[PDB]
Design a protein around this ligand. Structure first.
Ligand SMILES: [K+]
Ligand SMILES: [K+]
Ligand SMILES: [K+]
Ligand SMILES: [K+]
Ligand SMILES: [K+]
Ligand SMILES: [K+]
Ligand SMILES: [K+]
Ligand SMILES: [K+]
Ligand SMILES: [K+]
Ligand SMILES: [K+]
Ligand SMILES: [K+]
Ligand SMILES: [Mg+2]
Ligand SMILES: [Mg+2]
Ligand SMILES: [Mg+2]
Ligand SMILES: [Mg+2]
Ligand SMILES: [Mg+2]
Ligand SMILES: [Mg+2]
Ligand SMILES: [Mg+2]
Ligand SMILES: [Mg+2]
Ligand SMILES: [Mg+2]
Ligand SMILES: [Mg+2]
Ligand SMILES: [Zn+2]
Lengths: 60, 153, 96, 114, 127, 82, 205
RNA sequence: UAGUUGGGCACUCUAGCGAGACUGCCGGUGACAAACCGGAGGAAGGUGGGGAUGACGUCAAAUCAUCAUGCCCCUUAUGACCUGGGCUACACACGUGCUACAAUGGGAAGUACAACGAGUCGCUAGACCGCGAGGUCAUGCAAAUCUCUUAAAGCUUCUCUCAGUUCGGAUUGCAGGCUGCAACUCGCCUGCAUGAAGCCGGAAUCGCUAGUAAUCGCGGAUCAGCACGCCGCGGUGAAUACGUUC
């Protein structure tokens, strides 16, 4: 039931608390970063491609 | 470990008694890295010993160690279907380790309300060659003497 | 004039910072800096797998390098000189 | 002694009062401050004037049997109206939303491994 | 005349200045006893003076921040050893053999992902 | 609990239905899905059929129920023992 | 086991970001406009050998650099095709777009183009061994220090999926200074997805 | 009163560019080898500490719910909208945790020292109100400038005196505070009251070789609200390794 879920999320929420974040790239509801509007999967995928400016593997 | 013996890190002397042994005792009594509490217990207990006795507490503690530090230990050896203990001489480093471990462990089990009182009493008893810590040493020697037939191992 | 520069890479940041100093200094103004400011860091930890396997993670970081330029007793030419100079898209710049 | 309860004679007043049902640590401090009795005096040292002042102070509060009937009436009401909480009370299960798949041993009693 | 020394230990950074005096140590405008209320840690701070036989010769003004009292104590000990190196360059040997000039590089090891701590692992169950 | 300033809560659609019936010699059941609504004193004497997830359970509102939610009297899970 | 992405590993060591812009409050907006830009271009120019898109943002503008091994096709006759691209992008982005075409010299050394080429051949029922061998030949003739290729899935319609790969020269995936280009491309066949992975090792940095 | 203001960046610090360790130097051993042992110098010595980095493959291992996709199936339905309920149900069994069982402690008062981080309708100073959770007016800060953030262990005094307790804080009653359209099922926090088991844990079993374990707090991601979880941070800070039979 993905497309309908993606569409319904796009529309304004009837009540403020009901608005939630999905991955804009794939629609995943869980583990969506606010800075990037991406889930952990797409984030890791695109960070590898070098298409998320400023992000690189962290080591210390 | 398999490679071989490792480096043993040195301990600095006690600030007021100028004894490494006192520092080692403080570490044994220490819990959760709370050395301030550990040091207070040891220094209070050496002041209790300075009161119940007119002698230098460091002297009393060293006499307690002489009566508690074991000389022969039993080293479990598994031979075939029979596992028996083999008497072993205790190297000097482990001697103080066992002495400190036994004195502290049995002080924690004493009946007095505060640890420094419990530690001072346990120290003084050992200095007189009596108490639980001395009994642990007596049993350890008793076990080795019984298994003295396996000395050749 | 106070100029704050921010970029994800310090190599371009130094190049652009030098251009601000070189143009601003050459036009008669006297400049302070560039002053290194603490580089910001943000850490993101994501589960490496798509399903279960919680123990395996990957660490990503974003480092924001930043510099400060203070132009003192600026000449009239500074206002246009520090605006004709166009910086690379990666280097952010705020004036005053 | 004070409210029909022989409060411990050896303890300090602040704590001895806590042995009264309806007096906690904070309430004991309040009643002593009102009466004017030092918190450090053992109750064995309380004079008849001080004890009566405490009794007068405590008589103002709802304690012991009066409190127990008050609370039991509240639970009784929850059961009578058939509320969700009342059923939780009657069936011996947590009443404040706690999960029961695990734990809940305080309400349920000892484990019946059968 | 003042002699400057920087000492570091864990995350503590101590700026230490020596001046000839009574052996007085003041730390952040407070004397050593009040600032470092642990007797053994104050003995750590005075190790460089003992090994160089400069006990009582020098006062110490210490501006230290970061870390904890034990970490700052080790930082101060490092700063005095460095500052005492400006006093007389020939103290180097005595300070060196005591390990006082060495910067103790032991830092907190970072937490590892998947481990509860740097090395502590989650409790394991075969079945 | 709910802040005193906010006042007690009741859904307007439910509050309207009770209000329409206050002056009634013979009351009729009020069918509602509003478990979240507080029982006001004006509810006393009414039977409010509260949805429990699959059916409307008729709850008779006695004055002793005031302050409790309608859902407290319409259990959602059925458990008869293991 | 599993291996780090060859490009993700070297991003910020010897490889730079393709999204070459900075932002704080519009970072989320800018990032997902880039994804719509990249997605749109991958559809419009699917026939041109478009490999790398670099996006630069200057205030309301969006400078886009498109690396193509067929610049003439992308531009068109007298800039007709790129001009139709700026208008479509302007509408999509909602702001001014400048498009810069860059000639890809040595397309045989570009992993995405090589991977795409192998993927297209597999869709033509070309022998998967043949498709990889001749890609390897071209890359090495172009001067690659080494090339490695792999195809995974139901090869030639086999019921049981397997992976078959070939390599030539050196592909030191652990050497961080090595400039190793990587691409994964999918070929959709009658039997399902076939995964084509290409690693190309150019002059180390 | 204040690093406050003047003045100076010296020191610290911030950050670019660099310097430094390379068995390079010296003694011994070694097959004129590799290398090993020790030594000097040095902040650092033999991979300095830690991290990233995971070969060909293995388990038809996991994932068709991230995404994609062959084939199959549904199509006024297995699609789609809504309100309510459920995913938090509890005779029970197991995994991982948290808090305890006290005086190396509990309580009260006084006093000191971090680091990583986060912040615009957000972080919120100061003042005032409230026992408190918090509220109110209001201030600075898109920030090494303002704020969250005076860290807790700690230290110094007073108290309690071995007691299921001034230990423990489960459970419940009542009264509140917040966020939200709403917290009954299902929230977190507060006050008052209540004050359960628990006296250190059978067979068995787990982690850890130092700045580690142990213990102490602090920040962050998700997030209106909501973690004892996760990620990261610093404080304090040990014991032991004879040895390779098992
Ligand atoms: K979400
Ligand atoms: K529940
Ligand atoms: K459990
Ligand atoms: K499928
Ligand atoms: K799918
Ligand atoms: K837990
Ligand atoms: K457990
Ligand atoms: K105490
Ligand atoms: K709720
Ligand atoms: K246990
Ligand atoms: K939160
Ligand atoms: Mg939400
Ligand atoms: Mg886990
Ligand atoms: Mg009571
Ligand atoms: Mg719950
Ligand atoms: Mg399987
Ligand atoms: Mg499907
Ligand atoms: Mg669940
Ligand atoms: Mg007891
Ligand atoms: Mg190890
Ligand atoms: Mg730690
Ligand atoms: Zn996604």
């Amino acid at each position: 039931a993905k497309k309908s879920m993606i569409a319904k999320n796009k529309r304004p929420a009837k009540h403020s608390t009901q608005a939630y974040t999905r991955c804009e790239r794939c629609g995943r509801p869980h583990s969506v970063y606010r800075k990037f509007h991406l889930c952990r999967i797409c984030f890791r995928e695109l960070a590898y491609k070098g298409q998320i400016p400023g992000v690189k593997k962290a080591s210390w | 470990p398999r490679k071989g013996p490792v480096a043993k890190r040195d301990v600095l002397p006690d600030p007021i008694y100028n004894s490494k042994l006192v520092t080692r005792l403080i570490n044994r009594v220490m819990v959760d890295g709370k050395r301030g509490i550990a040091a207070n217990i040891i220094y209070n207990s050496f002041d209790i010993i300075k009161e119940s006795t007119g002698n230098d507490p460091l002297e009393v503690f060293e006499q307690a160690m002489k009566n508690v530090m074991p000389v022969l230990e039993v080293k479990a050896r598994r031979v075939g279907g029979s596992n028996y203990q083999v008497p072993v001489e205790v190297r000097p480093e482990r001697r103080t380790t066992l002495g400190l471990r036994w004195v502290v462990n049995y002080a924690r089990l004493r009946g007095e309300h505060t640890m420094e009182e419990r530690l001072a009493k346990e120290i003084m008893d050992a200095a007189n060659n009596t108490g639980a810590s001395v009994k642990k040493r007596e049993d350890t020697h008793k076990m080795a003497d019984a298994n003295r037939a396996f000395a050749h191992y | 004039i106070r100029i704050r520069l921010k970029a994800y890479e310090h190599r371009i940041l130094d190049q652009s910072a030098d251009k601000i100093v070189e143009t601003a200094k050459r036009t008669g103004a006297d400049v302070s800096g560039p002053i290194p400011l603490p580089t910001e860091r943000s850490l993101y930890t994501v589960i490496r797998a798509t399903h279960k396997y919680k123990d395996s993670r990957e660490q990503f970081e974003m480092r924001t390098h930043k510099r400060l330029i203070d132009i003192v007793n600026p000449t009239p030419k500074t206002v246009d000189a520090l605006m004709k100079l166009d910086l690379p898209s990666g280097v952010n710049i705020e004036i005053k | 002694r004070i409210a029909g309860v022989d409060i411990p004679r050896d303890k300090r007043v602040v704590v001895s009062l806590t042995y009264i049902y309806g007096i906690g640590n904070t309430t004991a401090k309040k009643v002593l401050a009102n009466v004017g009795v030092s918190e450090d005096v053992r109750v064995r040292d309380l004079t008849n004037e001080q004890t009566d002042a405490i009794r007068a102070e405590i008589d103002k509060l709802k304690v012991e049997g009066d409190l127990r009937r008050e609370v039991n009436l509240n639970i009784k009401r929850l059961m009578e109206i058939g509320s969700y909480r009342g059923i939780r009370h009657r069936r011996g299960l947590p009443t404040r939303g706690q999960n029961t798949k695990n734990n809940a041993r305080t309400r349920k009693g000892p484990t019946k491994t059968v | 005349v003042q002699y400057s020394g920087t000492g570091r230990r864990k995350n503590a950074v101590a700026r230490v200045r020596l001046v000839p005096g009574t052996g007085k140590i003041t730390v952040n405008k407070k004397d050593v006893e009040e600032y470092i209320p642990h007797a053994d840690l104050r003995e750590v701070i005075n190790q460089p003076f003992g090994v160089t036989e400069t006990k009582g010769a020098y006062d110490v003004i210490v501006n230290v921040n970061g870390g904890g009292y034990a970490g700052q104590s080790g930082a101060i000990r490092h700063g005095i050893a460095r500052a005492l190196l400006q006093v007389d360059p020939d103290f180097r040997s005595a300070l060196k053999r005591a390990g006082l000039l060495t910067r103790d590089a032991r830092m907190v090891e970072r937490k590892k992902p998947g481990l509860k701590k740097a090395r502590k692992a989650s409790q394991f169950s075969k079945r | 609990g709910r802040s005193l300033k906010k006042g007690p809560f009741v859904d307007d659609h439910l509050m309207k239905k009770v209000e329409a019936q206050q002056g009634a010699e013979k009351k009729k059941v009020i069918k509602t899905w509003s478990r979240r609504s507080t029982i006001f004193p004006s509810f006393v004497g009414f039977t409010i059929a509260v949805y429990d997830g699959r059916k409307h359970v008729p709850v008779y509102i006695q004055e002793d129920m005031v302050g409790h939610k309608l859902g407290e009297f319409a259990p959602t899970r059925t458990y008869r023992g293991h | 086991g599993q291996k780090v992405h060859p490009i993700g590993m070297r991003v910020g060591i010897i490889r730079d970001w393709d999204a070459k812009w900075y932002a704080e409050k519009e970072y989320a907006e800018f990032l997902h406009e880039d994804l719509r830009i990249r997605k749109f271009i991958a559809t419009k120019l699917a026939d041109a050998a478009v490999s790398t898109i670099e996006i630069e943002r200057a205030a309301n503008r969006v400078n886009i650099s498109i690396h193509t091994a067929k610049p003439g096709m992308v531009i068109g006759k007298g800039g007709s095709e790129v001009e139709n691209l700026r208008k479509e992008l302007n509408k999509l982005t909602g702001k001014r777009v400048h498009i810069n075409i860059v000639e890809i010299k040595k397309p045989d050394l570009d992993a995405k183009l090589v991977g795409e080429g192998i993927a297209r051949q597999l869709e033509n029922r070309v022998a998967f061994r043949r498709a990889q061998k001749q890609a390897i030949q071209r890359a090495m003739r172009a001067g690659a220090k080494g090339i490695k290729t792999q195809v995974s899935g139901r090869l030639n319609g086999a019921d049981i999926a397997r992976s078959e790969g070939y390599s030539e020269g050196t592909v030191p995936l652990h050497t961080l200074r090595a400039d190793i280009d990587y691409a994964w491309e999918e070929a959709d066949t009658t039997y399902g997805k076939l995964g084509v992975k290409v690693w190309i090792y150019r002059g180390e940095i």
